[PDB]
Amino acid sequence: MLGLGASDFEFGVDPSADPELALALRVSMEEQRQRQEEEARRAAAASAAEAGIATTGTEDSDDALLKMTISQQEFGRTGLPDLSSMTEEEQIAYAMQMSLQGAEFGQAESA
Amino acid sequence: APAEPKIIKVTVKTPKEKEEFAVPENSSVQQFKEAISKRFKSQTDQLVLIFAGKILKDQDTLIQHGIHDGLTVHLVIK
Amino acid sequence: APAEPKIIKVTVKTPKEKEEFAVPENSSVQQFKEAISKRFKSQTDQLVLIFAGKILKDQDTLIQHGIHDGLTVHLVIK
Q1: What are the start and end residues of every segment in region (Disordered) (chain A)?
Q2: How far is it, in rounded angstroms, from Cα A91 to Cα C13?
Q3: Helix (H, G, I), strand (E, B) or coil at C52
Q4: Residue A54 buriedness (CB in 10 A; 0-12 / 13-18 / 19+)
Q5: What is the fold of B1-78?
Q6: CA-to-CA distance for C1 and A73, rounded, in angstroms?
Q7: What is the four-CA torsion angle of A100, A104, A106, A108, rounded to 10 degrees?
Q8: Which of A16, A97, A101, B61 counts the highest number of beta carbons within 10 A?
């Protein structure tokens, strides 16, 4: 039964029995979404500019195949991350990390 | 001024009104609470921050939550 | 030595190789990029320098960053 099951979501809907908190979190999530949209559209806008500056082609499908093929190869050959294979940002970041003599921890989720 | 810690502006929304606060991107929630508490003349023990769908407290950090400049935080006093 | 300008040899490091360029300590990043770009036959449009954990641009100066004789630089081509 829905009533007995999940305790009828008596408190599984409004944290601390305060619907306001639920709304605040919902809005917060929406605020992040709005910011995300701006960034998402920002990349699209920048990408469009790159497309306009550069030549136009319809080899999108072929490009996708290259990304998939290089992506799998990159993982397998992670030990040897060629600069050419990586993007300019990746190569730049690598040099920057070395400059700081080990920038950041370099590890995710310490354990 | 190539300083690592860059000041960020976060829009704090409260049941009374909304006010933007500028604080170091590497600042802690406790520091942010202090700034907000001053503006609203409230207490860090009565006001609670909300972001990313989670409540932010002193044990939490601004950058730790990904709160950078041009961000929107939800302040809840109660 | 500090008195009057002085020529310094900066070691530029590139993904292909590194080279040493002799230029006045009062050389600007723009001038330096031009010198490196000439030897490497590259363009300042894609030539980006790196030092002190910060990308150096034509808007900055070599001495301004502390670049002197024997100093090393991280050149990155886009």
Answers
A1: 29-60
A2: 13
A3: coil
A4: exposed
A5: Ubiquitin-like (UB roll) (3.10.20)
A6: 54
A7: -170
A8: B61
